[PDB]
Design a binder for these strands. Structure first.
Ligand SMILES: [Zn+2]
Ligand SMILES: [Zn+2]
Ligand SMILES: [Zn+2]
Ligand SMILES: [Zn+2]
Lengths: 193, 182, 182, 193
DNA sequence: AAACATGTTAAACATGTTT
DNA sequence: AAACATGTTTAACATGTTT
């Protein structure tokens, strides 16, 4: 069952979240809590930062997995309802079963591991734009973290991993993901807890 | 409106559409599913171009771009295929290509046509509008309307349909109130 | 409502019924006893068909099936006579037959009519509703109403009655609150 | 982050606002609230009064700065929209980025601090006209106090400072500035609050 | 049935524009 | 000035779940 410990690796790999506006309540992040609260199917900008240029076909794989020990062995797919619902799939090219999607990147390739059957999504690594210090990747989470027949409100967490073009892990960072309806409210309540 | 040889047509099933007002009310940067329907297979490369333009005769000659604020605000731009100036964007299609006319300077976005899915009866396109219908320094609340055109791989027009677009914050409210004027 | 020649009628004695709201509030997959009463013996094969349909004019044309989750979730399906797609089920009757209309695609369930028990005054049918009135990908909280129809063995209608169905989790609460709106 | 406390200084430095007509609703002042309510790009007359002639190159610098602690460190510039909009900049000589402008004075010089990057505008001090008790300076505020991509309705306040020709502060006065569309209405509502 | 978790639906408000 | 148009801010409401 895939590792979830932070491992900076030779390229000082790192992921962070910086707010796209100046509200914009579509999502929010508890650096303190290592939790990302965000709305379903909406877009989440995630900042990647290295300290030294990674290898060649270097890729960034984002994989979802249940937080709690009891479920870790269960794959994380979209609930039956959404995996068919006309919406979010109609003009889509991405596997309707996959939870995690990346928008704005034709090269993005979705993958199901033949043995573990674990779904994940990869994007070829490209350095930041000139004058920019972050490579930004656009993720989309396709099921509330409470879809019955899916996560059924079981905490999950994302494992973004920087890997060599032939799957060797060069770096890994994790954060708990909780896709809902009122990221604002929920984060707030979660913090008063 | 020009149905053309393939009896080209657009229709709609965070946004809403007044059939009889030929007006689309939708929130900014939110996704707009749009239905395309032909009667006979179009040529081969056949593309679907979506172009914005001002409704009022006063302003038709002025190109339609995103207001300066949005145009250069990391937000929505940062990790993006499309140019930050373009108002119309299409999501869910790597083949989608954005184009600026060298002479007219007009911005538009094309997407290669493809028959519907088996059993289906519509070629559905995903459009995103990236500036409110009121951005100062942009549309400055000047009504605009979208011109979706089915064209031949080399730019020959095969059909054209058009509806008024009004991307705001309360498409519901606005639509309703806009329905009160009668 | 069409009483018909046999003065056909439906009535009610985990669920509850607002007589004056013609609304049935009941929990999912729980059992609903429904009372049938005629005035004169119906024909011979005479059947009682229960069909679901959306109350709102907007959606009447759309068939009513179980949401995808329930439709294919071993739970409630595994060992079952009836099709997993069908919303309405009848328990306690081997003769009960489920039917999908080839043309309209509409789902429904029939049960052969039988006079009441001796001394009794009602033909009681046992209905099960298999999806909440709010299942995403199904009724998506769109009010539906049941159409129980007494028909002739060959499908001729002899009578029809109808009540609004709202299968939820707290029929008590919902009913009460739904009674507060007045 | 620039000081905002009133400091009369050796020359009994003072700023006040006296109404140019006898309506004229282009602006208004709540002496009581220390708030100036005024329309964008329109002209605001501000009265300067000393008690003893200031030094030589003595200047009057007006600098904008956010009121609330959370933003004080952020410079105050014109929102992107106005910094390009053909209007208000076409026949203008002043930096389209600058919020505060002074009209009716060729010697007025706009300045961006190389280190802090803070924009301000200076005007050489000149005593009142004969028989007059005030040196009047004409300011123009170039962005609503709600321009998105700019102040985004964040309260700001002006810091007019009397300084020696080589930047030594001889006096300073502050007032909250809220440039809007209906100074009348807004002030009224603000007072019923 | 109580206290709670969480998606759905919108109202009250702030503030520029039109009349 | 009074009304109108519109983005924003915040809340209430509906309903399955948990206790
Ligand atoms: Zn789901
Ligand atoms: Zn804009
Ligand atoms: Zn269901
Ligand atoms: Zn501005």
């Amino acid at each position: 069952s895939p590792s979830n410990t932070d491992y900076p690796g030779p390229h000082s790999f790192d992921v962070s979240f910086q707010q796209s506006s100046t509200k914009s309540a579509t999502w929010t992040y508890s650096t303190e809590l290592k939790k990302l609260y965000c709305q379903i199917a909406k877009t989440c900008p995630i900042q990647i930062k290295v300290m030294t240029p990674p290898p060649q076909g270097a890729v960034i794989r984002a994989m979802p997995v249940y937080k709690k020990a009891e479920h870790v062995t269960e794959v994380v797919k979209r609930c039956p309802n959404h995996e068919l619902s006309r919406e979010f799939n109609e003009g889509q090219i991405a596997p309707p079963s996959h939870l995690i999607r990346v928008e704005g990147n034709s090269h993005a390739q979705y993958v199901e591991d033949p043995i573990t059957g674990r779904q994940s999504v990869l994007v070829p690594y490209e350095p930041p734009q000139v004058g920019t210090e972050f490579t930004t990747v656009l993720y989309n989470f396709m099921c509330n973290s409470s879809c019955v027949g899916g996560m059924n409100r079981r905490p999950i967490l994302i494992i973004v991993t920087l890997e060599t073009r032939d799957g060797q892990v060069l770096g890994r960072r994790c954060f708990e993901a909780r896709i809902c309806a009122c990221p604002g409210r929920d984060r707030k309540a979660d913090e008063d807890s």
